[PDB]
Every structure is written in C-alpha cells, then in structure tokens.
Design a protein around this ligand. Structure first.
Ligand code: NAG
Ligand code: NAG
Lengths: 50, 50
C-alpha cells in the first residue's frame, strides 16, 4: 500500500509459488552402441597406404 | 400483420375478459472474477526473463 497505517480489509501482497526440487531427465533405453571394438580391438589393422 | 383499428369519433372498445399472463426476463448480474500473475504469464518460471 506504500503506507504505514493499514486500514481494515484484505489485500493482495505476494504470489506464492511452489518451487521445483529435482531436475528429472528421461531418455529411452540406451541401445545400439556404435561399433568400436571391431576397430579398437583388432589385430588386422589395415596398411597405411591401404 | 396488417391491422386497421375501427376508429370512429363516437365508438369505443372495452374489454370484457382478461388473461393473467406471466412473462420472463433474464438479466446477467455478474461475470467470472479472474486474477493474473505476470511472473508466471509473461516470464513463466524463468528468473532470467523476469
Ligand atoms: C364524426 O364521424 C363521422 C363518421 O360517421 C363523420 O361523418 C363526421 O364528419 C365526424 N365529425 C366531424 C365533426 O367531422
Ligand atoms: C374469460 O375467459 C375464460 C377462459 O379463459 C372463461 O372461462 C370465462 O368464462 C371468461 N369470462 C367471461 C366473462 O366470459
């Protein structure tokens, strides 16, 4: 009210807000891993020119 | 509908009976009381915007 004396009544002061606690992140099942064991674990490394 | 009242300078028409009718009038008196919140509407749950 920008005043020191408040007349009898009901006044809108603030806006109550429930605030979040956790940050949920959901993504599908992690499948189809990219093929790298065939290139990282292999004794048949190609030639430098080939 | 067209109508020509039988007007003449010495004749009168006087009712001999009556009907007690009931009319209906409908008047709005109030609307929906609404309230708004800028901190949730314009810049919804984002302190950077507010
Ligand atoms: C009154 O009405 C009659 C209709 O019959 C008409 O002839 C007469 O002229 C009227 N009176 C006057 C003063 O005009
Ligand atoms: C007026 O009308 C009602 C029906 O609406 C009837 O019963 C009654 O007899 C009438 N009155 C006269 C004086 O004719």
């Amino acid at each position: 009210l920008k005043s020191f004396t408040v007349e009898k009544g009901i006044y809108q002061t603030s806006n109550f807000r429930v605030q979040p606690t956790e940050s949920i992140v959901r993504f599908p099942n992690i499948t189809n891993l990219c093929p790298f064991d065939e290139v990282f674990n292999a004794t048949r490394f190609a030639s430098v020119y080939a | 509908a067209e109508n020509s009242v039988a007007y003449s300078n010495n004749s009168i028409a006087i009712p001999t009976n009556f009907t007690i009718s009931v009319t209906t009038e409908i008047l709005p008196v109030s609307m929906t009381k609404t309230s708004v919140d800028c901190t949730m509407y314009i810049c919804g749950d984002s302190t950077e915007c507010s």
